[PDB]
């Protein structure tokens, strides 16, 4: 616990990076999180939404 | 653009649709700005023979 501040900063940076790289798996109301599965299941007028 | 089609093929004139007429001889772009005008001409073009 002597170097807790630097370790905490590193852990916060790593957690921010992990959250930013994990937010891609979310749907955000869409049908899927993968663009290939969306551009190959709907037409060019409904997949745009 | 003046042309004659089937009464069931009117829905194919809308942009971003499907159909044999809408994909082989006539097609509107996705950024079409205008109005589509259509009317019945059975007593004008159709012939008894």
What would the 3-class secondary structure string for chain B be? CCCCCCHHHHHHHCCCCCCCHHHHCCCCCCCCCCCCCCCCCHHHHCCCC
Residue from A42, A44, A45 to probe the interface with B (highest B Cβ count within 10 Å):
A45
DSSP state of A40: T
Across the A:B interface, residue pairs with CB atoms under 8 Å apart total: 7
3 state DSSP class of A1: coil
DSSP state of A26: -
Resolution in units of Å: 3.4
Task: For residues B3 and B41, give the distance between their C-alpha atoms in angstroms, rounded to a whole number.
Answer: 12
Q: Inform me whether the C-beta atom of residue B11 falls under 8 Å from chain A C-beta atoms.
A: no
């Amino acid at each position: 616990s002597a170097l807790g501040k630097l370790q905490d900063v590193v852990n916060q940076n790593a957690q921010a990076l992990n959250t930013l790289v994990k937010q891609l798996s979310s749907n955000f109301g869409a049908i899927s999180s993968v663009l290939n599965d969306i551009l190959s299941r709907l037409d060019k007028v409904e997949a745009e939404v | 653009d003046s042309f004659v089609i089937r009464g069931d093929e009117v829905r194919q004139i809308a942009p971003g649709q499907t159909g044999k007429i809408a994909d082989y001889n006539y097609k509107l772009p996705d950024d079409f700005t205008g109005c589509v005008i259509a009317w019945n001409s059975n007593n004008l073009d159709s012939k008894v023979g």
